[PDB]
């Protein structure tokens, strides 16, 4: 079992766009040096969330066919996926990119940022759940593309156009599960389990934003 040359080409474009992300030194240094107070911890999180929006747009722009979509549909997809894409990238950075000590300090900062356990608990439950699947880089990149190119987001005018871009990605992901995990037929079902779990963050994030009187004007406009 192998990917077709067309599938290999689609995957390469996705992987290339995904591998561009790299946490800048200034943010990493802040996690280490800043005072351990609710306001300093929250500011670090806000900067990370803001930087992710820029990272998300750059990744999305290079997804095959994205630039062929109507301008308003490009905006609707970005707005619709911003929270889910953020948590998925977070799961990867917490479980793979940051060193043990830095991730331990970032978790300490997240847990002492003035954010309620109602939102912190499902967040860390999700990271552990993603960690269990021992996802490859190809799995992270494809899952991110599938999340972004979701045809059922609100305010999309040409859904059929989005469906034509999403279906080949789901096909590639299922085929990689059959190639790399043939002894584990439930592997693709497990990856799907993460897509639905990611959707639950849309509510948790919306409630968290309405709870502010901490107030970050820029992020509130992107997430509505």
């Amino acid at each position: 079992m192998e990917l077709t040359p067309d599938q290999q080409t689609l995957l390469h474009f996705i992987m290339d766009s995904y591998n561009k992300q790299r946490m800048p030194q200034e943010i990493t240094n802040k996690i280490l040096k800043e005072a351990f107070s609710a306001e300093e911890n929250f500011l670090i999180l806000t900067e990370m969330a803001t930087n992710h929006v820029q990272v998300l747009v750059e990744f999305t722009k290079k997804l095959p066919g994205f630039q062929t979509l109507d301008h308003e549909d490009q905006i609707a997809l970005l707005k619709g996926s911003a929270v889910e894409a953020m948590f998925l990238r977070s799961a990867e950075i917490f479980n793979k990119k940051l060193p043990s000590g830095h991730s331990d300090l970032l978790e300490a900062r997240i847990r002492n940022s003035g954010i309620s356990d109602e939102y912190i608990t499902p967040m860390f439950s999700f990271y552990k759940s993603i960690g269990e699947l021992k996802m490859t880089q190809e799995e992270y990149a494809l899952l991110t593309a599938i999340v972004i190119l979701s045809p059922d987001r609100q305010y999309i005018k040409d859904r059929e156009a989005v469906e034509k871009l999403q279906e080949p990605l789901l096909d590639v992901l299922q085929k990689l599960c059959k190639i790399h995990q043939p002894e584990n037929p439930q592997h693709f079902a497990c990856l799907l389990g993460r897509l639905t779990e990611l959707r639950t963050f849309n509510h948790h994030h919306a409630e968290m934003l309405m709870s502010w009187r901490k107030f970050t004007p820029l992020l509130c406009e992107i997430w509505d």
């Binding site: 747009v57 750059e58 722009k61 301008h71 905006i75 707005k79 992107i222």
Partner: peptide
């Protein structure tokens, strides 16, 4: 509306 996303998308 969506002024930041519009700018990032054009850049």
């Amino acid at each position: 509306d969506h002024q930041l996303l519009r700018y990032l998308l054009d850049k």
